[PDB]
Structure formats: structure tokens, C-alpha cells
Design a protein around this motif. Sequence first.
Motif, PDB file in Angstrom:
ATOM      1  N   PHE A 117       0.827  -1.199   0.000  1.00 19.23           N
ATOM      2  CA  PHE A 117       0.000   0.000   0.000  1.00 19.23           C
ATOM      3  C   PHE A 117       0.858   1.244   0.000  1.00 19.23           C
ATOM      4  N   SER A 120      -1.116   7.135   1.682  1.00 16.84           N
ATOM      5  CA  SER A 120      -2.374   7.775   1.317  1.00 16.84           C
ATOM      6  C   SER A 120      -2.123   9.241   0.965  1.00 16.84           C
ATOM      7  N   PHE A 134       1.118  -5.920   4.342  1.00 12.47           N
ATOM      8  CA  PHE A 134       0.463  -6.934   5.160  1.00 12.47           C
ATOM      9  C   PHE A 134       0.878  -8.303   4.647  1.00 12.47           C
ATOM     10  N   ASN A 136      -0.369 -11.876   5.440  1.00 14.96           N
ATOM     11  CA  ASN A 136      -1.477 -12.500   6.170  1.00 14.96           C
ATOM     12  C   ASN A 136      -1.626 -14.018   6.049  1.00 14.96           C
TER      13      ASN A 136
ATOM     14  N   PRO B 129      -6.461   5.917   5.196  1.00 18.04           N
ATOM     15  CA  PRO B 129      -6.990   4.783   4.434  1.00 18.04           C
ATOM     16  C   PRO B 129      -5.894   4.112   3.613  1.00 18.04           C
ATOM     17  N   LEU B 130      -5.921   2.786   3.527  1.00 17.74           N
ATOM     18  CA  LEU B 130      -5.004   2.049   2.669  1.00 17.74           C
ATOM     19  C   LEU B 130      -5.787   1.326   1.587  1.00 17.74           C
ATOM     20  N   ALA B 131      -5.856   1.944   0.414  1.00 20.02           N
ATOM     21  CA  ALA B 131      -6.516   1.352  -0.749  1.00 20.02           C
ATOM     22  C   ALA B 131      -5.477   0.566  -1.534  1.00 20.02           C
ATOM     23  N   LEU B 140      -7.938  -4.444   1.985  1.00 23.51           N
ATOM     24  CA  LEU B 140      -7.887  -3.005   2.265  1.00 23.51           C
ATOM     25  C   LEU B 140      -7.255  -2.786   3.623  1.00 23.51           C
ATOM     26  N   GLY B 141      -6.913  -1.542   3.918  1.00 23.56           N
ATOM     27  CA  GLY B 141      -6.295  -1.266   5.193  1.00 23.56           C
ATOM     28  C   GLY B 141      -6.583   0.073   5.817  1.00 23.56           C
ATOM     29  N   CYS B 142      -6.378   0.154   7.131  1.00 14.63           N
ATOM     30  CA  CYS B 142      -6.380   1.431   7.837  1.00 14.63           C
ATOM     31  C   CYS B 142      -5.183   1.551   8.758  1.00 14.63           C
ATOM     32  N   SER B 181      -4.671  -2.152  10.507  1.00  7.52           N
ATOM     33  CA  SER B 181      -5.686  -3.180  10.400  1.00  7.52           C
ATOM     34  C   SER B 181      -5.919  -3.471   8.923  1.00  7.52           C
ATOM     35  N   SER B 182      -5.987  -4.751   8.578  1.00  5.84           N
ATOM     36  CA  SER B 182      -6.325  -5.153   7.224  1.00  5.84           C
ATOM     37  C   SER B 182      -7.686  -5.813   7.228  1.00  5.84           C
TER      38      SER B 182
END
Lengths: 212, 215, 225
Positions: A117, A120, A134, A136, B129-131, B140-142, B181-182
Motif C-alpha cells: 500500500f 495515502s 500486510f 497474512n 486509508p489504505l486502498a 484493504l487497510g487502515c 488493520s487489514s
Amino acid sequence: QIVLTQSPAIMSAFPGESVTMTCSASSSVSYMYWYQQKPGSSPRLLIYDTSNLASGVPVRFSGSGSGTSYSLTINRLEAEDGATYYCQQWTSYPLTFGAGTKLELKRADAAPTVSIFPPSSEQLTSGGASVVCFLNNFYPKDINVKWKIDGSERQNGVLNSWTDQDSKDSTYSMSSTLTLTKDEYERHNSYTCEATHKTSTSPIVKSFNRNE
Amino acid sequence: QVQLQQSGPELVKPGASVKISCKASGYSFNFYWMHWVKQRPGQGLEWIGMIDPSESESRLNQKFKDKATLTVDRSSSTAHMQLSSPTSEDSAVYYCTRSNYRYDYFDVWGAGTTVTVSSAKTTAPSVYPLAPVCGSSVTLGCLVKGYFPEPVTLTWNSGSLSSGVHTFPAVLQSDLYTLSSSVTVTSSTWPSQSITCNVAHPASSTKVDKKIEPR
Amino acid sequence: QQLSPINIETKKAISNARLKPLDIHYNESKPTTIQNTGKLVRINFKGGYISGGFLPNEYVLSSLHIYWGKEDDYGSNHLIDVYKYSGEINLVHWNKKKYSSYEEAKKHDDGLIIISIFLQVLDHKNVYFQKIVNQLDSIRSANTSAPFDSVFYLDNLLPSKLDYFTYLGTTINHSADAVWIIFPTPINIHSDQLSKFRTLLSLYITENYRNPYKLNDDTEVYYSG
Ligand SMILES: [Cl-]
């Protein structure tokens, strides 16, 4: 004070396996007590008076021992038993606990699902730039993440976090964040998170170019 | 119900005393010894001491002799522990637990009160936001960056989206925490349906909801 | 170092048949106040002391504590050869010669000496023990305190035989260490006298005794015959 030494410090086993953890005392203990603490919860009584099961404790749990040597046995491990287990003595004050045996679970090897990612827009407006990766649902927990910028390895500004083993599927997840300034971020184009895990012989690579 | 209710998370200035509380309900308060147990991030369980509620006679672990003061408020069925001149070594989770009057076990535990002793500044997080970068499934993520102290809470779609979620324990760097968080859903769900991460940081009175928009 | 109470095994006790006799002076003991603590009955005293024995010096009487169970069959704290009595009176004494107050005495292993008197339920109404049950009406609630109503001589609550077992243990609530003086011979009381204790509010107080702990390897129980 009575010192309680718990071995092993950390262990894992498949469900169905037999697990034994020991509690050694610096001097003789009349009765040993056992507490189970699941991650994020308070300790909870499991065994009292050496070998008596607390109300509702499944019959797969048993306690044993005398003098300075005591043990807890799980005969046919279940995933929900993943926890840290503490022995405790009530022979002399102060009351003391062992340092715990952390018990985790084995499952089939599983490769991480890897996502990358870019920073932003909202973070860039503040002058910072974080790149998140991530990794996972993998097993075993042993994993190596390498950040690369424009081909070169970057070690500075990396922070990692591992979740507790998943209580339903026994996998682990990891977050890796590279934090640079907005200035540094725009000085480079290619950003890469490279995951090394025993599942594949070749690294799992996720990447993006700053301006697509 | 027999229950032990503990006070909320405490940020304590170094050297500034702190009192934490443990309210008992559902049983005869005077009849059971109340104990206090300390748990540090990597240090097992330590018995601080106990108090007999019927007469407020306490016994302290000598390790905590000049640190912890155990009292009870019989009228309010509440046990208290005071920490004098706290240091960073006093940062931990503190449980109150009742031992059975007859059997030598701890049959009721509180949820534990987290005490952070630090002069670090209360700081609100920024929520990003993680797009995904510009088949079948999408993560997705935050990112919740730069807050102090713990905790923050994070939900997805007001909690309606709970499976396929990984919220990672916070990491502490330079007096600030960062958490991410994903969330993984089917590609037909996002972005045709909105996904919003909901973040609270009670210490800074922060509440934020960030919709994840495609880049 | 030994948690109280215990089962005293007579077959394991060490006979100390060279000790000075135990000197009990309760003639000047007067009851001040009586408490319902929510867990037990406490009668506070002024005056009176005990001298050794094993005692390095005299210890002043400060209070009396009473224990029972839900049956007249099973109510004391200490046992002798696995025999548990109907109840147990504890008389707390402190080392005033060495320490300034009870509070300072309670922090040391030579600060407290507790005398244990057993209660045996029989067909025998104890007129002297009664002087205590009568006070109970004033202290039904918890935690309440009342002045001790009228004339009472503690000396009357002594057993007819003063041979005893002694060991280093703790208070019943474990708050501090204490040396125990324990008379095997009990005083006799009626069922009607003990049952009154079970009508005290605890917030309902059927039982308040503690189970016994295993004797530690290095714990000695001495007997003065
Ligand atoms: Cl009398």
C-alpha cells in the motif's frame, strides 16, 4: 521467597498431541495451582490442589507432582488451549507464580498473502509517507521481510507487528510499515516488500511504482 | 452475578501517586480476601499483596512494601490499591482477584487496569486509508499513526465486517504508537459497497471514520 | 514460615518437658468492646497478660476471636490427630515489651502469641460462655460495634487442663506470622449457645473456619506436658 521455574518457556504442538509442562520449585510446595491465561484475557483457574480440575475444565487436562517437581499435561491438545499457563504455590508468603509456559499450535505450512500500500494522499499532505505491507495467514511464524527502494535494501524506519496466533485457523499475520518523509518518498520511484518464508523457495515480491 | 469491576486505563505522571479501584458485586464482600496481581508486558504474574476486607488487615509482598497501599471501602464494597511515587517500572496491568474463603484459589478476576507511568504527551492519532494499488479478492487497510497512550479501538463498517480482519498490536516508537488493520473481502463487495474503518482514541477524545476510496 | 491452621499430629510432636510452666494472668482483663466483623466475632480487651513457658518476656492480651462451622460436628481451625472440634476461640497477645504498638508487633515473628481454646458441643450449658452469646443481640449486623454489656471474667473460659502444643505459624487470616499456644482439652458448650453465632449478617454466616495446611518439613510442633 519460593521461586517457581517453568519449562519449556515456549512450545507448540499439533492438536491431538500430548503436551507436558513442568514447574520446579526452589523448596517443597504442599500443593500446586495452575492458571490459564488466553491472550488479551485475565488468568483463569485450571487446576487446584495439585490435581483437582476446576469446574468445567475438560478431562484432557491433568495435574501431577509433589515436593519440588510438578507438571500439567494436556492429553489431546485442542486449538482453543493456546495460552500461557502459570503454576502458583500457596505454601509460603509471598505467593509466587512461575514465569509461564506459552503454548501455541502447529498446523500445515501456509504461505503468506502479501499486499502493498502506497502512502495515502492524506498522509502526504502532512509531510509524512508510510508504505505498508500486510503478510497474512501464514505458518510457521518465522518470516523475514526486506524492504527495497529503487533496488536497494532499506532497514531504517521499518516497524513490524505480529498478531497472536489465530485461534480458529492457527495462522500468523504480520504488518510491516516503512515510514519516510514526503521529501524522501518523492526522491524514489520503486518500492518493494520482499517476503522470505519456508513455503516458497523464491521470495514473494509485492511492488509499486510511485507514479504508476 | 459475582463480578469484579476495575477502573479504566490510567496515564500517570512519574512521581505522581495513583489510586486504582476494584468494585465487587454479587457476593459478601467482607468474607473473601482480595488480592492484587501485577503483569508487565514480558514478566509473568507477580503477587503484590492481599487484604482481608472484614478488618482491612493487609499483607504486602516486601517487593512492594513502599510502593502499594491496600485499602477497602466496606460501605461501597470496593478495594483500592495506591501506588506511591510511580516509575516506568510500575507500568503494567494490575488485576484484582478474590481468593475463595475456603479453597486456596483465585475464583474471580477483574479485567485488569492498565497503568502507564510516563511523561509522554497525550496525542491524537491520524487515521489513513489504505486502498490497493491501481482477481476474486481484495485486501484493504487502515493505518492509525502517532497516538499516546493506549488504547485505540478499531472496527470495520461499525463492526458489521468482522471476519477476514487483522488488527495488529500497536508498536511504540518515540513516545508514539502506530497500529494498522487489514480487511479482506471479495472483489465484488469492494468498491461497489463502502468499507469504512472506525477509530476511537478515548484519551484524546478522538473518533474518526475513514472510507476507503479506490485510488 | 508455616501457614495456619494445621492438623497437630501428636505422634510427631516434640516433648519439651523442661520448660517453665505457663503463667496466665487474666484477673485484670476487662472487655472493652465487641465486634461483628462480617466474618467472625471479636471481643477487645484491656489489661491481662501471659508469661512463659517458652516466652522471652510477657505478652499483653489485646483480643479474642471466635470460629465455627455450619455443623456442631465440624467448626474449629486447628485439628489434633485429624479430630476437629465444634469451634475455636483465639486469644491474641502481643510483645509490648519489645515493640511500641500492636501494629509494630504484627510485623515480626516474635510479636504475636495466640492462645487457642477449643469449643466442644455437648449436653452442657456453659454459664460463663453465655456471657458472650448475650452480647450477640447488640452485634447482629456487619460491621457493627457495641460496648461489652456487663461483668465477664476471661479466666472462666480457660480449659480444666493447661497442657499445650506450640508451633510457629500465622494468623488465621494470614496477615502476619504468630506463635500458637494450643490446648487439646476443650471447654464444653451447648448447641443452643453456638447456633446463635450463625444468625449474624455477613453482608447469613453459617461457617468461618479455615481448612488446615500441610506441615512444612522444617516446622516443629512442641508439646508441654
Ligand atoms: Cl465470666
